[PDB]
A = this chain, B = another copy of it.
């Protein structure tokens, strides 16, 4: 009744006033979605004073431009966000950025705005919840029973990533996912009649979703609440709730593209306030009756969490081992000495492709670290499959797996895999999750990968077939630019291990990570075990593999090119040139080491040549001269392609000799030195 209507008006006007203060941002969807936001938050279980309660319901604003709405909800419910923060919407350094960021905004589960991402993140939160519940729940112990609520608009529904994730979520029968479509006939691009005339509901039925339609979502909060109740009864399908709204509801300019993405006029804001019973002379008003009503819901939710804490204590008594495991995960700690399961190799061991070494690592650590789950997309089972002793993550109704399973069959859906991985990480409970594909097609998921970095999520791409070393599939499949792209993105560890020990170091980093996504670039072709490699040294990101105190040159290399550098060293010896070799399996980890450590690897006074069979971009950080591949590849047997491009011991040696000659009579300082 009346306090609910007052709350809705309060939300609407807080959002409009925030946009007005910034003179920037998006008032239309906040106005249109305030009734639904009020109704959904009243059904959600959450604690503003404990944003990490593991059995909270999660909310995701996929239409992230509408974040003045989210911030208004968080303020009204007493999260660590205030009206003073709302006044600083879109202002440098504020807690209310123009699109919501999980690192900066209390109560933002994920970073959204780039369209399509949030709904996929919601799929991942729901996937994680189902896996977590299957792992821990017991009779009389509903440790995990929470829902995932997502708001999304027409823009998200046009982005292909959301189609991928929605097809998969329907297949996975994710009944605790409840998404709400803001059916307002507008996107950033304009009216939907211009480019978006598909039958959305028919499409979602084709994916196996349940549908509820709310024809008057501008006012009918009773029907929105009833739609949630209906969705909760359908336990084997995700639900799409069609919210037919007027964008900018209440504005003089309601129902037009003009209210999508620009501040309202001042006189429009005045008439909004007067017709909803607010003072047109006042901004950022919060009626105390609204606060009281919201506080009551918080207090009830806090009593639910208090009871959950007692359930968890009783669970530890009845299921001591599972309880201790759950506690450890909620504390953010891996199993003690888990890394003793990492395989270790010697130079007497056989050559192995780093793809195969990686799969061996996973097979050893998955049984020991329950919070590891993962999967693959656009990749044959022979290139990655589940660890022996596990099953696929599937609804049991299919007969193909169980929600307790550990390996996700993403289908040919790289981009959704990337965004779903972000949602699994966002769930919490120490999930360390991975996704396998070919390195060249990690690029299909760039939108999500960048968000892994910005969101500080410890996700891992298992990215095989890293180079021309894959051979016959040819230039359509062979990375050139890919490592440069991701190394140039802030906060991405890009491991390119050369051998067995380096591959174990790469996984130690990826699994221990709490704030940095990892990409592991792995080979189709076999590589030798290196003399001088170890987990310890490779864990520094870069290390001296072959030390030469009288070096004429140092060759720095990664991955498959480290063995090439070692072979080139022998050719150079016959030419009277003494070389050292540095292996640089992760540039980010190396960069984070001390200046003195880094200089011990890349000293002053000696020319340094890099060797890596893809783009030379970035390599001047570490080298004076760069031997790389800055053209597309070729379709043939891999050794013949390496020969064609002179990535041979003799070709490296020739360039090393030319490098020595180029610096004769010159003073050479480490590439690590800088003017500023």
Contact = CB atoms under 8 A, between A and B. Distances in A.
A90 interface: yes
Given A411-B189, A446-B446, A480 B490 contact: yes
A484 interface: yes
Interface string A414-434: 111000000000000000000
A454 to B, nearest CB: 6
B208 A198 contact: yes
A46 B159 CA distance: 35
A171 interface: yes
Nearest to A155: B412
Given A473-B98, A490-B630, A197 B208 contact: yes
Nearest to A201: B206
A661 to B, nearest CB: 7
Contact of A160 (B160, B446, B661): B160
Given A412-B188, A443-B446, A484-B488, A636 B92 contact: yes
A524 B161 CA distance: 27
Contact of A636 (B91, B398, B440, B480): B91
A663 B676 CA distance: 12
Contacts of A451: 476
A318 interface: no
A95 to B, nearest CB: 10
Contact of A413 (B158, B206, B446, B674): B158
B114 A441 contact: yes
Contact of A632 (B202, B261, B454, B477): B454
A78 interface: no
A190 interface: yes
Contacts of A189: 376-381, 409-412
A92 B633 CA distance: 10
A251 B141 CA distance: 53
Interface stretch (A278-286, A303-311, A570-578, A613-621): A613-621
Interface stretch (A7-15, A162-170, A322-330): A162-170
A98 B474 CA distance: 6
A171 B196 contact: yes
Interface string A190-226: 1001111111101101111000000000000000000
A442 to B, nearest CB: 9
Contacts of A197: 170-171, 208
A101 B475 CA distance: 9
A288 interface: no
B164 A159 contact: yes
Contacts of A490: 480-481, 630-632
Nearest to A170: B198
A592 to B, nearest CB: 14
A500 interface: no
A193 B400 contact: yes
Interface stretch (A338-346, A352-360, A637-645): A637-645
Contacts of A617: 484, 487-488, 617-618
Contact of A93 (B98, B615, B636): B636
A297 interface: no
Contacts of A499: none
Contact of A99 (B22, B473, B654): B473
Contact of A205 (B159, B202, B380): B202
A454 B481 contact: no
A203 B203 CA distance: 5
Contacts of A627: 676
Nearest to A26: B473
B158 A476 contact: no
Nearest to A205: B202
A475 B447 contact: no
A481 B411 contact: no
A675 interface: yes
A276 interface: no
A663 B491 CA distance: 31
Interface in A640-665: 640-641, 644, 654-655, 658-659, 661-663
Contacts of A625: 674-676
Interface string A82-108: 000000001111100111010000000
Contact of A635 (B92, B380, B398, B615): B92
Contact of A158 (B412, B480, B488, B654): B412
Contact of A207 (B167, B198, B377, B472): B198
A167 B158 contact: yes
Given A450-B481, A674-B625, A99 B474 contact: yes
A471 interface: yes
A618 to B, nearest CB: 5
A207 to B, nearest CB: 5
B99 A635 contact: yes
A206 B204 CA distance: 9
Given A163-B160, A197-B208, A641 B92 contact: yes
Contact of A379 (B111, B188, B620): B188
Contacts of A489: 480-481
Interface string A433-467: 00000001101101100110110000000000000
Given A171-B195, A488-B481, A476 B111 contact: yes
23 contacts: A24-B472, A92-B644, A94-B636, A97-B474, A97-B634, A98-B635, A101-B475, A158-B411, A159-B164, A159-B414, A160-B162, A160-B163, A167-B196, A188-B412, A189-B379, A189-B409, A190-B380, A194-B392, A194-B411, A202-B205, A485-B485, A490-B631, A662-B674
Interface of A: 22, 24-25, 64, 90-94, 97-99, 101, 111-115, 154-156, 158-164, 167-168, 170-171, 187-190, 193-200, 202-203, 205-208, 257, 260-261, 376-381, 392, 394, 398, 400, 409-416, 440-441, 443-444, 446-447, 450-451, 453-454, 471-477, 480-481, 484-491, 615, 617-618, 620, 625, 627, 630-632, 634-637, 640-641, 644, 654-655, 658-659, 661-663, 666-667, 674-676
Top 3 A-B residue pairs of the complex, sorted by shortest distance between their CB atoms: A160-B160, A92-B636, A195-B411
